[PDB]
Design a protein around this ligand. Structure first.
Ligand code: HDD
Ligand code: HDD
Lengths: 726, 726
């Protein structure tokens, strides 16, 4: 018995806030959170407590500390089969990572529609507001390996496996509404250009290098998603605070056989929020697991990630009514033209038990659809359909990857397919072919119908010659980038310009930077000029004279394309650093902590060392982390309570904490003599918007602080931060 | 033609300093740098210029921009074999990464001994000072994935493949002279404990988590290598500036059959140097590829990494003469007891062409020895011999991994082994077995002898019963950690305290922190007290009374265990940041660059934007990076030349660049009016050792700066940095 006698090794099996208890496998942390998929995994869940340690063949091991040798200082013997089994399993633990989105974090949850959608689709999982469908969702970055950092600038994946009663449906989306390229034949080129360069394998998790911008400069179709990635969309605060999109136009098919075109959306109920670049980049060093950690801890705290599924629906007869082609995945459908109709809610409420078994081995593929859905001729979607089945043959070791437990349907599956590596199902059917008489032709085909019918493809008319040709309706590259640019606030536009400027500064061949700037001048001259000024490049008179691309269907902006133009803040689940001193005003700390708790905001008590400090009144304050150990990068706001401020006033870490939080536009609140830190951040005596200050933490101090947190960051501080040495 | 007309897309094929040209594949950057192994890869090197783009079956492609479809807006057709080949190859690009040391950076080079070693070994590669052996070297971290960062705190691997005339010898070592564990049976336990925890797969590239410290606390044999990892050895400045060690005692066998015990060492001819923790951690975010990049760029510059191979030799009759067991890999052999004899020099002088083909697929294994070497019964080495052949069957896809080009011997290899996946060699032998008469028994066994003989194991006597038992002589755990502690300078000791304090602050379960401090009390009470104080732990009276462990064979210290106690600085290949302004004094820059060039130190010119600035005399200066884009983390020292200092005096990033460099103990040199930056880092008028200042940058100013850079960091400044907010 090596556990502490007080039982403190084991986290409580109840919701607890971030940092309050060690994290644990979901079935131990939250044994009563169930759904039909979680329950179906019980056949493979393995416990440990009270069991003997064995080999994989069930033989009990007596001494798991030593190899078998001839003499206690002698050579290891070949006959040690316990050693060799254990080292062999170790030696073959790794499987190939995903070719793209190798870095990702996943959770289980459930989805339910708000009302039946039978009028527009026969998909069973959308047929009844009381039908609950379990989900497994993985969120990811794109470029970096499985061991890369989370808060890089990149697109994010947002992949949802719906375990429906009529089959698995995987909605395999990203967090921006378009992709970089038009036709899947170019996917290896694009991916190779953004991935680490092939001679030296640098850089990891960064588009900031020559080959990515070379390809962008040569393929202007890429510019629209490049605009999104260079905005603060590329650096989300959390997977809970980003949008999701299926990108492609798909079809819904109802029981009468009518097709409606659809694009899929996820709206985050926590709101949209992103980091700023300097914070994101520094956070990749201070905590490369920050998004993975934040998702796991939100679920352990009960701050369940919630998202609303929504559809943009366009009738078949309106296919050609826009200035862009609906089948072109580099174009978005502005919500001002086609609104998102709310469909249902997804809540992620339990972590996995074992990351490798459930996250690493999960296989999502957008070809996994169900009756009631269908594809379109989008030429990027069409090639995706080939890739996601083919890649699993190496990644997951063969054609039986649907028998890996996380991938299994919860509905029935029966067919004539047999064998393959790793075959788990032992088929008893006398027949392995159809048509057969020897088993009365079972299992049997099922005609299509309104419910529980076979899959039949929508009978779309095809007419044309066999060509490798891009549709001319796809040959427009700048109007969507411009619509995105004009829809952003002034501070978002600044962050875009700073994104392009920072990334192009890392491109060693200057002509590439020049070619990118020339493309920017086809989108918007103000953008192009601002980036050029940061790169020391002067636009030519020709460039100054490029006419801007047209409006998109009459629109000159669409505010739903901005993260921040329309307030959607939610403070629940956010966190505040509280910088302690060795004699904290206890009345301040009571008021601060209860106000935060009332709004579901978490706190971390920080000091210059671990252990405890004692408040003016004798209250013992346990310390969560030191100032350097939990930097301001990891919090949303900073509060400094009154007390003995001299204890920390000359602490360089405490001062720099406030300087970093101030640079990154975070709300900062200072009570009583903590206002002596105004000099560290150069705040005027009469104060400034974004800094809460008062004689004590009472009255409206915490409400003012919370109001600032609901607006996420103090954008008005931006011109004040250039001078700050931080 | 898409290339620029000026040819500026292609780097010069001559040695160039870091940043001067885009980096390139080895064979294009240094086509005239050759060795027998590099030449032998010519059968598989493939160029590209002037060749048509084809499928892998050699069919020319006309249109590599589009899939084949039925009409230009129609569905993709299954008969598009060009698209499916291209996407199939992409879909199967990844192979499993190495179970441990998945993150590593490699280069080609050559070794030669200083004199023949035939008196102590018959190994051919050590027989003649003028017989050169090609090598391929891979340096690595241990815990993190292939996409993790370089400048983590961790042990580093240092693996050298020697392509000898009598077979491949792989010397598969680390940068510390011992390992964490004694018997290979525990390796999966220890690796699992240090790797990301299994529920949530956090943390990447960090031992700072509960499971690793839980295992440490329960297995005191780990503490010696834990001391090394928590010292600045854990955060080297470059792979050029760390030591290498084979760890285990092996044998040398001479022609007369005499066995000598040997432990292997690499001495870096660039000297020993490490980062400091705050700089290393922030560097993992600002450039997670810093060591990979620095190695590739040093080779491109001609700053070839050089290492001296060294042997500690112990006669067979002296096996039991020390107070530790020579076969225990948690024990080092102090160089005060047994000196390192210099054996030869290895120079790494060409980077690979393709990182995946040559680095990712290289297989090193310490069981690849040659005649003249042999193993010992060290129980960690004994089990390593099983693992490195086993693991390549999944990582490299089967038993023909020696036919992957980088792994091929350059000497002859012929045997009766056949088939296996991706069999390259087509054997013409009518026989695939021996003994055979049908091929007159070829290829034939060869008796052992003085040179070119068959391998025979040294006939060590084995006497003992079949037991799984640890030798009692291995059961001592604190004397080597203590010798290490006592051998460090006071600043190195402070860094060890800080590393333990930082790491244990991240362990959520307090009793684990407590148990590790109790282990530290068994090593040294001053260490244990200093760590306990940072964790808010008070040692008990019993802990204060633990008797220190014995000296190691009478030693109270061995200064060879310190990075810094004996000077061995070499400035060649280091880099300085020069912070420009828009009217630089050309006379300063002349003097600066002259003095740097004389000592082989590179410069990077930084400014507040990219493009160019013009100096006082009209010299146009191209800017390498912005102050934010290439932070002080990435350089060894900072120079600020005179000129229009008002241009940059209030620039936040320029002032922060100096505060960060100052915190991290780097030399800083300020010329003329640049001395106004003294205020930012609170230097008094009379100046401070470590800050060079004069009216202009002259010979004297540069000599002083260069002398500082030879001492690597300004340790005496440590007391002054606690108060700097940076
Ligand atoms: C033709 C190839 C191809 C193209 C054009 C795309 N992808 Fe893809 N995608 C892959 C081929 C691929 C892949 C090779 O099949 C991956 C990696 C391994 C896997 O299981 O699937 C994958 C993984 C993958 C994942 C991670 C799923 C997971 O968590 O395991 C997401 C979220 C996306 N992709 C999303 C997209 C979106 C939104 C695209 C454009 C609209 C896109 N993919 C285009
Ligand atoms: C019994 C298992 C075992 C044990 C006890 C060790 N290793 Fe090991 N090592 C492996 C099993 C392994 C491995 C699983 O076989 C690896 C990874 C995959 C590969 O090709 O080899 C490996 C890789 C590996 C590499 C990377 C080689 C490369 O760059 O590809 C280095 C430098 C070391 N090890 C060094 C050590 C040292 C110095 C050890 C202690 C003295 C040690 N290993 C103990």
């Amino acid at each position: 018995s090596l556990a502490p006698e007080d039982g403190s090794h084991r986290p409580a099996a109840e919701p607890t806030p971030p940092g309050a208890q060690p994290t644990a496998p979901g079935s131990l942390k939250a044994p009563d959170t169930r759904n039909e998929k979680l329950n179906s995994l019980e056949d493979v869940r393995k416990g440990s407590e009270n069991y003997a340690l064995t080999t994989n063949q069930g033989v009990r091991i007596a001494d798991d500390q030593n190899s078998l040798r001839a003499g206690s200082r002698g050579p290891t013997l070949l006959e040690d089969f316990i050693l060799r089994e254990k080292i062999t399993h170790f030696d073959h633990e790794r499987i190939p990572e995903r070719i793209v989105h190798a870095r990702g974090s996943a959770a289980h949850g459930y989805f339910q529609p708000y009302k039946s959608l039978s009028d527009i689709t026969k998909a069973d999982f959308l047929s009844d507001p009381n039908k609950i469908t379990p989900v497994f969702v993985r969120f990811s970055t794109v470029q970096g390996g499985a061991g890369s950092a989370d808060t890089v600038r990149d697109i994010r994946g947002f992949a949802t496996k719906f375990y429906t009663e009529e089959g698995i449906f995987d909605l395999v989306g990203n967090n921006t509404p378009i992709f970089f390229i038009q036709d899947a034949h170019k996917f290896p080129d694009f991916v190779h250009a953004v991935k680490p360069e092939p001679h030296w394998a640098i850089p990891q998790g960064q588009d900031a290098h020559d080959t990515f911008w070379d390809y962008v400069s040569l393929q202007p179709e890429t510019l629209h998603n490049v605009m999104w990635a260079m905005s603060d969309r590329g650096i989300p605060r959390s997977y809970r605070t980003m949008e999701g999109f299926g990108i492609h136009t798909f079809r819904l098919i109802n029981a009468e056989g009518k097709a409606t075109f659809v694009r899929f959306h996820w709206k985050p109920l926590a709101g949209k929020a992103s980091l700023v670049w300097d914070e994101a980049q520094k956070l990749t060093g201070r905590d490369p697991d920050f998004h993975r950690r934040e998702l796991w801890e939100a679920i352990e705290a009960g701050d369940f990630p919630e998202y609303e599924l929504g559809f943009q629906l366009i009738p078949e007869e309106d296919e050609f009514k826009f200035d862009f082609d609906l089948l072109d995945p580099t174009k978005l459908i502005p919500e001002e033209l086609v609104p998102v109709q709310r469909v249902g809610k997804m809540v992620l409420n339990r972590n996995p038990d074992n990351f490798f078994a459930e996250n690493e081995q999960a296989a999502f593929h957008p070809g996994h659809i169900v009756p009631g859905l269908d594809f379109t001729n989008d030429p990027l979607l069409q090639g995706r359909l080939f890739s996601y089945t083919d890649t699993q043959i190496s990644r997951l070791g063969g054609p039986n990857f649907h028998e890996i437990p996380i991938n299994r349907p919860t509905c029935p599956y029966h067919n004539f397919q047999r064998d393959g590596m790793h075959r788990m199902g032992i088929d008893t059917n006398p027949a392995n072919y159809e048509p057969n008489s020897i088993n009365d032709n079972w299992p049997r085909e099922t005609p299509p119908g309104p419910k529980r019918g076979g899959f039949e493809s929508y009978q779309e008319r095809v007419e044309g010659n066999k060509v490798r040709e891009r549709s001319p309706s796809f040959g427009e590259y700048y109007s969507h980038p411009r619509l995105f640019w004009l829809s952003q606030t002034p501070f978002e536009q600044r962050h875009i310009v700073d994104g392009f400027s920072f990334e192009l500064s890392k491109v060693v061949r200057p002509y590439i930077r020049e070619r990118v700037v020339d493309q920017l001048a086809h989108i918007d001259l103000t953008l192009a000029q601002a980036v050029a000024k940061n790169l020391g490049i002067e636009l030519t008179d020709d460039q100054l004279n490029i006419t801007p691309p047209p409006d998109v269907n009459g629109l000159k902006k669409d505010p739903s394309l901005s993260l921040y133009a329309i307030p959607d803040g939610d403070v629940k689940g956010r966190v505040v650093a509280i910088l302690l001193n060795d004699e904290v005003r206890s009345a301040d700390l009571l008021a601060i902590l209860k106000a935060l708790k009332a709004k579901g905001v978490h706190a971390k008590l920080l000091y210059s060392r671990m252990g405890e400090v004692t408040a003016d009144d004798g209250t013992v304050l346990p310390i969560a982390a030191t100032f350097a150990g939990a930097p301001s990068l990891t919090v949303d706001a900073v509060i400094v309570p009154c007390g003995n401020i001299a204890d920390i006033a000359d602490n360089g870490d405490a001062n720099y904490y406030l300087m970093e939080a101030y640079k990154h536009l975070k709300p900062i609140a200072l009570a009583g003599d903590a206002r002596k830190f105004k000099a560290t951040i150069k705040i005027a005596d009469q104060g400034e918007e974004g800094i809460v200050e008062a004689d004590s933490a009472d009255g409206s101090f915490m409400d003012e602080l919370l109001t600032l947190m609901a607006a996420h960051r103090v954008w008005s501080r931006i011109p004040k931060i250039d001078k700050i040495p931080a």
